[PDB]
Write a protein that binds this DNA or RNA. Structure first.
Lengths: 266, 1264, 149, 50, 50, 20, 99, 49
RNA sequence: AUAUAUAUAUAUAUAUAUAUAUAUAUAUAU
RNA sequence: AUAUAUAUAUAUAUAUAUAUAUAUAUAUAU
RNA sequence: AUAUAUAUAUAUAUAUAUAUAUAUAUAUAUAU
RNA sequence: AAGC
């Protein structure tokens, strides 16, 4: 899910409200006037005028964006595990976001990336000011390098391909999902790929210990209790970080769920 | 009323000062109380001929209310939620009809409960069923917030007031409190109950039972009725007991009715809670004519809170009210809710007072007493979704370019920063450095105390701990078959006894369970009960905050008991020309996050500890190695101490947030996990941290930011004249600012106003909402002062209300007596009319003194004789032919009060006893030739005295438990406690020395080895009792009652050997025409006379009793008083210093200071209060607000007035008798009604030596 | 702050190497033998034992005092303010007598060159009114805090 | 310390060190004021409206 | 300013402007005889009543 | 009837006090 | 009101024509202290830093003082009375010495 | 014996103020401070008086 | 998902009625 | 001038109605 | 309890002046 | 589940 996705939930998006902020500042009569006022001909905020820009902008964010973001994240968790992007961590903190939180930085000059990107709505300089506002909005925490995420996302799978690239996929594949008795109701949760011995070892685990409530193809569920610990999967058996909820081939039901090792017979 | 007098002739005549009290009449009245029925009480109500002035319209809207359907909905998370129509806060219970959800109850067809079938569809998953059941359960919970059925209180009020007006023994006249015919609340209560009941023959609108509530099937019943009835009965009781003006009571009733006629009763009360204060207290003395104001002085050091009283200063128009007028705000508030009239009469009445006297403060107290006193109740889901969903608004944040590289989780703050955070960082830096340098920090006993501090019998969310540990494949011992709760932190500690810290490291990131508390006139409060490892790792934060509060600022540690607070501070601050500023932080816990505060405090603490602590473990937490990146380019590793390891882990936890677990019992299908950043309320570091940050931010404003943000020279001079060490007092989120009056009068109000605006602006840029009040009044810790007079707030002590947050059933029968006595003492502190209050308290004690029980066809009645209440501290009225109303409730409790009143009326008692044929031949030292041994037995006085000391709670001890599992539990607890081998060696040395020397002198030596046993007993007693334990109660009480006795305890028999001699009265302590406590006035003679004769306690109690002990703090589980008593017993009984050394070694003190303290104690002379504890003599709780110390010192003369007598000689080495006899003199003087009287010792029957031998015999024999 | 941890390190090393260790009970044992009457309001032994309180952790401060001898060029060990009597004391008070005794024994071990003057002025302060001496000027009179010199 | 009674600690060394540090700072402001600032003022002055 | 400074024994200093004025009229100076007469009147009416 | 006042109630008791 | 814009504008022009840069990190490094004197509160090095408050980045006073030399005849630059020691101060107070 | 009646502690400032009006006001010590019957040196109480 | 129609809910504004409070007017009694 | 009753105007509350804006449910068309 | 003398307290009744705020008229700045 |  993109960072800006929360923006267009309101018919007037957050961006035009930010544009209209200018009316609350004395001596500024237009957004262009605001831009030339806040910058010093070298695309640097005056470090004081940006102060009142933040003064005016923060109530808008904390009074409008935060609640809609809260609902958006609450609904988003229902469809299953997702990758969420944001611009400042305080957005997620104030929205009571649930899940692992990562602050990542980049080995580039991000600010220069804006004004070259043509076809902007309110002008590139507005995007620069917006980026400065978000950076000031962020908390005080050291962001790790972005590579720490992509490495986990890719390298285990790429390594495992060197071992499983030849075996029969029927034996060396697995599936974890929510079981619902009335052929039989089953919605996938995690996809597992590993050698035969590893899958066989996985087969005898207490998958029935965790329960959730499934409602209904576009099904969606919600977990009660505690989430699944990572070591239950393995230090082996590289898996999928994200999943989308769907029922494979009719009244709307809210029966129950426990997850089962429906992986395979072989 | 005819049946009332018919049933309670003798009882009313006895408790109204006409006839002598007796046990048999008391029990007859108790039986009559037990024999009534609800409808009988209402028929009795029908017979009061109410007058016209008690009439007022009742809107018809209350009875007719819509359905509950439109007030609820289902969110996208399939959770029941409250639809809001009045704003963000309209999340309380709406006012809706209920009868269409009731299944008729068997054998009680007129009443019913929530439909069980609807419960079935609810548990299936139906939407409408879930809505209906949520509404039903929450309405039941709202109706369950009382102590006992209202009919008991109403009937007791009727019985008490049937006796008519009382005769004042001091004033020699009759009071003029209007009778029930002018009590508007009772008339409203009767009318509403009759209208609801209508033709149906049953009158009770609902029935309150332990299992819950049953509703009357009427089409006019509404969920808002129970709270309305509670408020009306409270007001009716208060009017008759405290002599309130009926005009104000009518306004209170009007407010209650308007609340009922609204969409949500609780929401309405919450939004309108401040009419009475804003219209009477905050707008008082607009035009001032005269009066007195006390002259108090603040001495040095002001850190000591030492104030001395000078006298009275006449007032003048120079000191009229000068704060900004609030007329517009009050009118707007009254208009917005349609109470503009009530505001109109309130203001008009307020303008009428021009002099500062007893009348004005009485009027203010009466006005404040009329506020509603319900416990606001709302479902937990809305509380969570309303309180944890707001975040701080850091309007001016710390620039990101002002941080170093990370050290594990922390990040060092540079010193070039333009932000104000630098001063906060410096303060915490120096605090940590000074803390870590104290040698006591490294003492094993100190660390053991800190570890034991958070090991209590209360919950700790152990389940989440369990699956968190299972998440890494670690199995804890189960302790199967233990008759104790697994959901206690003691259980958690037992399961965590022998695990490495590395294994339990992940446990800090576990979840958190739920916990709620309801308050009066305040939204329900939520709690996060942190688990054991979290409490362990939160230590350095707590220690640093403690150091700051103890040394670098002015901060109190008093509780919410009125006695222990600093009255002198408030009375000094309110008195002109001084002016006070009331500062509070709204949503204080939600305003402290990683963004501004935590990221700075954690870094400061971590850095300010490395030097004084390098390479040392702590609290079981060991040292470790972390990555270093502070300097640019170089990235290295760095060892850290145990405290720094805790800081790293706690920083991780703070950065992540918090994981709250919710299980809404009132809503089927409402349970989830909520991610929040709000600071926990259940941790040990909450209050101290909040106080420290409060003081630091205030000082920063006064020193740097404020001077740099205002230009008016008057404001600059004022601010430069203010410092926190001289003018600011803080505790948590509540703070008080004192503006000392200048030599030209008092500081200009405009300057104060602009300064207040400056603080309001200054609070925002780091996300603190400063709730500031400046109205010429002083408020601190919900204590209210005006012009040096404190105004008790009656509304915050509801007589009938009781906080119940869970769905559990209420307590067994005997428990309610504790609550009743607590109500009596609350009325005592609040200063009600003493005679009426005593009469009413007697009525209640009668109404609750009987209980039916079933013992398997042995249907018996449990009955408490009247004497047990007297032993519990409730004074008598008239007995043994004595004069009425000669005793005061400053009577002590237990043996002391008994001895006092016997000493006062011994001769009359003897003549009465003889005249009734209770005659014997063996002359007695106390009673001559009276046959007391049988009269006391038949009067049940011995029986009542002895059964008043039985534990009225079930003793879950002695349950069957396997030997192996119990010994495993005990050894696990001991292993957890005894970590460092040094402490174990110390305790072993102490045990060996004690066996060598101190064995055989006393039987119960406190020791660290007994802590596991006490912890096990406490955990076991925390479990739910069962039926056979209640049967054990019943049979024990019957055994005690049926038995026959021959004497009191040894201590009381010793006390009766002493007789005194009253003399001329004392000298007045304060001026007789100076109002100090509202209501304590000439119409309230006895409290007034006691206060003016003894004088108020002008020094805070916490610091006074801090010096009345040897060890300041001990391990949680042991009592410091027990250790002091054991030491003084050992010294008194002639044991040598090695025994005291052994005793000090058991509690873990190191050998050298053990010897030093033992020798010093042996040769030292101790205070009277500290020395009197050897015989369990404690200062009565009611005396705390009086200057008892000077009366101990210079008004209890142990030498007879006529000169030395033969028997009054104290043996030279028995000087502690000098300490004991002072308490006896104090009890005798304070028990008597009237002024304090100089008292002289008269005679001891057996001589001093015999009394000493008896006391030593008791001292040795106890503990068996 | 830059030099103090060095002194703690040296103290730890000294404690590791030295054969001297605290006698746990010597003071109490020798003071438990003095003869006195139980009828007296005051007891010298009580007061002295109360002021001493030998917490056994005192050898750390003793060791840092020893280590200070090697660095009088940059570090000047002095007696803290809190050790002196609060208001200046009085010879008639037993407590002040014991405080003077403690200071008199403690002072000669510090590296402060101005120590003897403070040792003298400590008694001079307690002795005011009882017994007088000529001082230099009106500022540093006989009633100044001894630590001011 | 003839004029600072009531200082229980001898702050002579600390005050002397701080004053010495302030004395010998590498502040180039006096250089600028003595040399360049008059030149800047002279250049600017004729162009002013006042 | 002279009178106020002298009356406060120099502990507080007040200042007056030094420039051409507007001839403000501030009548406050009277002879000693009038003060003595008023003092006698005051002592007279207060006389003999505590 | 006879609802006289509260201030007079206060003063009447005091007047009882002062009498001797 | 007439004078104010002239002095403000000349101050700005001098500020951004001169090669001189005001950098308080020089002071901070020279003092080279965070908070000395672990236990006893008196620490002159910290006190002088607190009084100076180097972290502030506004220096309009300096430029305005320089600009005032051109208009000696109509405007007089003086030190605000608030910068003087409180109540005249005393030599016994450490803060008064730094003032 | 040092605790004053009503703990007034105010006669000191009044006595200082009286120095300015000795023409019309003569501050005196009340009778109640003297011993009732004149006292006796054999009584310690009278010595303190 | 968009457009249109009907029902329901919320906010603002206006009007009427009832109740309460304030002001004005009339009558009886003093 | 006081007490009692009634009427009009203003304010608050409740109900009804109308208009505008927004949303939910049902149906038709694409 | 009756009569007389002295004194305190409550209730009823009567007058002036001033100041503050709001509103109307006139003008300046921003907007139309 | 139910804190300090």
């Amino acid at each position: 899910v993109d960072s800006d996705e929360v923006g267009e939930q309101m018919e007037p998006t957050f961006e035009q409200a930010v544009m209209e902020i200018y009316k609350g500042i004395a001596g500024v009569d237009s957004l262009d006037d605001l831009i030339k006022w806040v910058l010093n001909s070298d695309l640097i905020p005056h470090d004081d005028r940006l102060g009142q820009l933040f003064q005016a902008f923060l109530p808008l964010a904390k009074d409008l964006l935060a609640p809609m973001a809260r609902k958006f994240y609450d609904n988003s968790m229902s469809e299953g595990r997702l990758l969420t992007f944001a611009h400042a961590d305080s957005e997620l903190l104030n929205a009571n976001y649930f899940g692992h939180l990562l602050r990542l930085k980049i080995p580039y000059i991000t600010e220069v990336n804006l004004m070259i990107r043509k076809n902007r709505e309110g002008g590139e300089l507005f995007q620069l000011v917006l980026s400065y506002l978000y950076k000031m909005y962020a908390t005080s925490a050291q962001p790790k390098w972005f590579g720490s995420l992509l490495r986990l996302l890719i390298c285990p799978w790429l390594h495992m391909e060197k071992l499983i690239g030849e075996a029969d996929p029927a034996s060396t594949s697995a599936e974890i999902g929510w079981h619902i008795p009335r052929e039989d109701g089953f919605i996938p949760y995690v996809s597992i790929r590993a050698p035969r011995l590893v899958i066989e070892e996985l087969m005898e685990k207490n998958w029935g210990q965790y329960h959730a409530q499934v409602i209904v193809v576009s099904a969606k569920a919600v977990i009660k209790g505690n989430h699944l610990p990572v070591k239950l999967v393995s230090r082996f058996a590289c898996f999928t970080l994200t999943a989308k909820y769907e029922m494979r081939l009719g009244r709307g039901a809210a029966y129950s769920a426990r997850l089962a090792f429906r992986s395979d017979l072989a | 009323s005819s049946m009332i007098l018919t049933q309670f002739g003798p009882f009313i005549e006895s408790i109204s000062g006409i006839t002598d009290q007796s046990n048999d009449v008391f029990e007859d009245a108790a039986k009559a109380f037990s024999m009534f029925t609800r409808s009988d009480v209402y028929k009795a109500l029908d017979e009061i001929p109410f007058s016209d002035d008690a009439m007022l319209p009742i809107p018809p809207t209350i009875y007719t209310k819509p359905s509950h359907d439109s007030y609820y909905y289902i969110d996208a998370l399939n959770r029941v939620r409250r639809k809001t129509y009045q704003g963000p806060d309209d999340v309380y219970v709406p006012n809706c009809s209920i009868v269409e959800l009731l299944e008729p109850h068997e054998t009680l067809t007129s009443y019913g409960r929530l439909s069980e079938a609807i419960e079935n569809r609810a548990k299936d998953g139906d939407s409408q069923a879930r809505i209906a059941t949520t509404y039903g359960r929450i309405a039941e919970s709202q109706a369950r917030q009382i102590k006992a059925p209202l009919e008991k209180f109403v009937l007791a009020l009727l019985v008490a007031e049937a006796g008519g007006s009382l005769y004042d023994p001091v004033l020699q006249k009759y009071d003029e409190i209007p009778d029930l015919s002018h009590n508007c609340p009772l008339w409203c209560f009767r009318e509403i109950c009759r209208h609801i009941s209508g033709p149906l023959p049953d009158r009770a609108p609902y029935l309150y039972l332990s299992a819950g509530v049953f509703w009357l099937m009427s089409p006019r019943m509404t969920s808002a009725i129970p709270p309305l009835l509670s408020d009306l009965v409270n007001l009716a009781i208060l009017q008759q007991t405290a002599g309130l003006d009926p005009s104000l009571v009518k306004l209170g009733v009007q407010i209650c009715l308007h609340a009922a006629a609204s969409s949500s009763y609780a929401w309405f009360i919450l939004k309108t809670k401040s009419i009475f204060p804003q219209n009477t207290l905050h707008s008082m003395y607009e035009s001032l004519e005269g009066g007195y104001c006390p002259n108090l002085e603040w001495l040095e050091p002001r850190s000591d809170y030492k104030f001395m009283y000078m006298g009275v200063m006449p007032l003048s128009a120079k000191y009229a009210r000068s704060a900004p007028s609030n007329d517009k705000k009050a009118r707007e508030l009254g208009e917005k809710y349609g109470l503009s009239s009530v505001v109109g009469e309130l203001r008009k009445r307020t303008k009428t007072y021009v002099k500062h006297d007893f009348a004005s403060v009485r009027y203010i107290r009466d006005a404040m007493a009329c506020t509603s006193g319900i416990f606001l109740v709302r479902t937990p889901t809305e509380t969570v979704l309303q309180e944890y969903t707001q975040s701080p608004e850091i309007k001016v944040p710390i620039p990101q370019k002002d941080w170093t590289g990370p050290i594990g989780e922390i990040r060092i703050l540079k010193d070039t920063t333009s932000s104000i955070a630098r001063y906060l960082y410096r303060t915490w830096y120096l605090a940590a450095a000074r803390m870590a340098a104290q040698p006591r920090t490294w003492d094993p006993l100190f660390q053991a105390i800190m570890r034991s501090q958070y090991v209590t019998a209360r919950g700790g969310s152990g389940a989440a701990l369990r699956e968190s540990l299972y998440a890494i494949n670690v199995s804890l011992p189960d302790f199967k078959g233990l008759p104790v709760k697994a959901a206690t932190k003691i259980f958690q500690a037992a399961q965590l006894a022998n695990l490495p810290f590395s294994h339990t490291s992940v446990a800090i990131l576990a979840d958190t369970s739920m916990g709620l508390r309801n308050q009066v006139q305040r939204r329900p409060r939520s709690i996060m009960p942190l688990n054991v490892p979290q409490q362990q790792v939160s230590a350095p934060h707590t220690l640093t905050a403690d150091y700051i509060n103890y040394h670098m600022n002015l901060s109190t540690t008093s509780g919410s008991a009125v006695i222990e607070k600093v009255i002198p501070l408030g009375v000094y601050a309110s008195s002109p020309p001084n002016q006070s500023i009331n500062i509070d932080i709204s949503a204080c816990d939600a305003s402290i996050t990683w963004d501004f505060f935590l990221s700075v405090i954690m870094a400061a603490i971590h850095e300010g500890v490395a030097s004084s602590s390098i390479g040392k473990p702590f609290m079981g937490v060991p040292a470790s190695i972390v990555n270093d990146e502070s300097v640019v380019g170089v990235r290295a590793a760095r060892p850290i101490s145990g405290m720094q390891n805790m800081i790293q882990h706690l920083s991780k936890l703070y950065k992540r947030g918090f994981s709250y677990r919710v299980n809404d019992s009132f809503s089927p299908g409402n349970d989830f996990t909520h991610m929040t950043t709000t600071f926990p309320s259940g941790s040990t570091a909450t209050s101290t941290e909040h106080t420290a940050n409060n003081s630091t931010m205030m000082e920063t404003f006064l020193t740097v930011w404020g001077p740099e943000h205002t230009d008016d020279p008057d404001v600059l001079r004022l601010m430069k004249s203010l410092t926190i060490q001289r003018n600011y007092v803080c505790q948590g989120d509540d703070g008080l600012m004192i503006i000392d009056g200048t030599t030209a009068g008092k500081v200009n109000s405009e300057t104060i106003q602009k300064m207040l605006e400056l603080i309001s602006k200054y609070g925002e840029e780091f996300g603190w909402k400063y709730d500031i009040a400046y109205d010429g009044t002083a408020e601190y810790l919900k204590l209210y002062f005006i012009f040096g007079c404190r105004i008790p707030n009656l509304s915050r002590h509801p007589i009938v209300g009781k906080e119940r947050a869970n769905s559990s059933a209420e307590e067994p029968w005997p428990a309610i007596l504790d609550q009743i006595m607590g109500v009596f003492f609350n009325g005592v502190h609040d200063g009600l009319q003493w005679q009426r209050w005593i009469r009413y308290s007697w009525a209640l004690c009668c109404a609750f003194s009987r209980q039916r029980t079933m013992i398997g066809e042995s249907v018996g009645y449990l009955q408490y004789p009247m004497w047990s209440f007297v032993y519990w501290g409730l004074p008598l009225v008239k007995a043994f032919g004595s004069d009425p109303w000669i005793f005061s409730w400053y009577m002590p409790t237990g043996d002391l009060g008994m001895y006092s009143w016997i000493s006062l009326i011994r001769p009359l008692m003897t003549r009465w006893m003889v005249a009734n044929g209770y005659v014997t031949d063996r002359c007695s030292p106390v009673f001559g030739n009276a046959d007391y041994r049988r009269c006391f037995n038949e009067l049940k006085l011995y029986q009542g005295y002895y059964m008043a000391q039985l534990p009225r709670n079930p003793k879950k001890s002695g349950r069957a438990a396997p030997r192996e599992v119990r010994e495993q539990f005990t050894q696990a607890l001991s292993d957890y406690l005894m970590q460092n081998p040094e402490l174990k060696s110390r305790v072993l040395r102490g045990r060996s020395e004690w066996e060598k020397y101190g064995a055989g002198i006393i039987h119960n030596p406190p020791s660290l080895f007994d802590v596991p046993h006490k912890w096990y007993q406490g955990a076991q007693e925390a479990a739910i009792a069962t039926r056979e334990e209640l049967a054990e109660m019943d049979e024990t009480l019957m055994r005690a009652r049926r038995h026959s006795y021959s004497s009191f305890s040894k201590l009381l028999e010793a006390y009766l050997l002493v007789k005194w001699r009253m003399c001329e009265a004392r000298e007045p302590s304060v001026d007789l025409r100076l109002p100090l406590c509202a209501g304590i006035d000439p119409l309230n003679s006895d409290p007034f006379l006691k206060m003016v004769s003894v004088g108020p306690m002008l020094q805070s109690t916490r610091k006074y009793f801090a010096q009345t002990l040897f060890m300041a703090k001990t391990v949680s589980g042991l009592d410091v008083n027990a250790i002091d008593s054991a030491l003084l017993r050992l010294r008194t009984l002639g044991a040598d210093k090695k025994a005291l050394t052994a005793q000090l070694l058991m509690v873990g003190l190191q050998e050298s200071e053990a010897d030093a303290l033992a020798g010093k104690i042996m040769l030292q002379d101790v205070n009277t209060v500290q020395l009197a504890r050897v015989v369990n003599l404690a200062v009565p709780d009611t005396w705390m607000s009086l200057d008892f110390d000077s009366m101990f010192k210079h008004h209890v003369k142990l030498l007879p007035k006529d000169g030395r007598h033969l028997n009054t000689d104290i043996p030279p080495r028995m000087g502690w008798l000098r300490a004991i006899l002072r308490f006896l003199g104090a009890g005798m003087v304070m028990t008597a009604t009237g002024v304090a009287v100089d008292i002289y010792l008269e005679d001891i029957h057996g001589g001093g030596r015999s009394l000493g031998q008896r006391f030593m015999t008791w001292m040795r024999q106890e503990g068996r | 702050t830059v030099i103090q941890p060095v002194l703690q390190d040296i103290s730890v090393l000294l404690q590791r190497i030295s054969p001297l260790q605290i006698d746990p009970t010597i003071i109490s044992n020798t003071m438990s033998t003095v003869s006195e009457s139980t009828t007296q309001t005051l007891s010298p032994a009580s007061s002295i034992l109360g002021k001493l309180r030998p917490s056994n952790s005192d050898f750390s401060s003793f060791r840092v005092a020893l280590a200070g001898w090697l660095y009088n060029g940059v570090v000047t060990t002095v007696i803290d303010d809190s050790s002196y009597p609060k208001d200046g004391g009085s010879v008639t008070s037993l407590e002040n007598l014991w405080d003077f005794f403690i200071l008199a024994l403690a002072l000669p071990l510090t590296t402060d060159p101005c120590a003897p003057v403070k040792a003298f002025m400590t008694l001079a302060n307690m002795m005011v009114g009882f017994e007088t001496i000529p001082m230099d000027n009106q500022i540093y009179t006989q009633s100044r805090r001894a630590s001011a010199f | 310390q003839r004029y600072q009674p009531g200082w229980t600690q001898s702050l002579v060394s600390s005050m002397r060190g701080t004053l010495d540090k302030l004395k010998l700072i590498k502040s180039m402001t006096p250089m600028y004021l003595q040399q360049l600032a008059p030149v800047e003022l002279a250049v600017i002055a004729p162009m002013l409206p006042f | 300013e002279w009178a106020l400074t002298e009356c406060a024994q120099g502990y507080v200093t007040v200042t007056s402007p030094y420039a051409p004025s507007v001839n403000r009229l501030m009548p406050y100076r009277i002879s000693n005889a009038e003060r003595q007469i008023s003092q006698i009147i005051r002592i007279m009416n207060i006389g003999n009543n505590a | 009837l006879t609802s006289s006042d509260i201030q007079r109630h206060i003063t009447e008791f005091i007047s009882s006090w002062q009498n001797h």
